[PDB]
Amino acid sequence: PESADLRALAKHLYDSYIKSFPLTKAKARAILTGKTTDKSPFVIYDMNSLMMGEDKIKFKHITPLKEVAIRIFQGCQFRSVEAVQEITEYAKSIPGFVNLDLNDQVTLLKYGVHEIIYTMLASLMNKDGVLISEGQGFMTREFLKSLRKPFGDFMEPKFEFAVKFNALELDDSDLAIFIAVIILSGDRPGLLNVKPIEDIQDNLLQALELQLKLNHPESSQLFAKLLQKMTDLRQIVTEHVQLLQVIKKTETDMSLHPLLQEIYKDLY
């Protein structure tokens, strides 16, 4: 009945999610578990294995024009920039999003992308590390932790969030709707027209609720657990944003990409 419209929304978002994000959670998991006919990712657990992995992961393709912790961070930065492009394209596919006031689209993306980046990282992560370079590399958690300050502390809170978030066991079809809900948050600072945002989000949440009922019938109040994580994640992103503004000012030899600057300026 009304369920059917919600199911079609879910499916439309899935299809556009698949087009927008080349590396899905399914593909990432296939890789992390070895349930894949492709070669196993090169493991980077220290300085020397980074040097050894450079061909497999194409690490020199980051800087066609430095210190290690900086080089790793620039790699992370490179992908983040592309993540913002993917998130932005996906946002345009959300019914109603592009009819919003253009300053509101910007505001929604500006605050939303970091929250989504955390969920994207979770798909790429286990307890011990993160998939990099389109699944061709695996950088260990302890190697990232062992980097000098402030770089040593950058990735770890995302690892912490990921292990908890991954216990929910969402798939791509869930994630597609969850991500739509994050973007269309009517309580972002500086929004002009809260109402048409909340109207869309209301439909997305209903879609999310039904999706989780149907896709995870054995998981009682997964919806509730999911919304609580979404709130936790806002709080967490505040500290992520702080650390970058710190790094931008305190590290001279590292250039922060202009797009990333746009999204960190005047934020919390």
Binding site: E89, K92, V106, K110, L259
Partner: peptide, 11 residues
Amino acid sequence: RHKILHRLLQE
């Protein structure tokens, strides 16, 4: 301004 974001959204 958010010039790049604007560009990504409009195009």
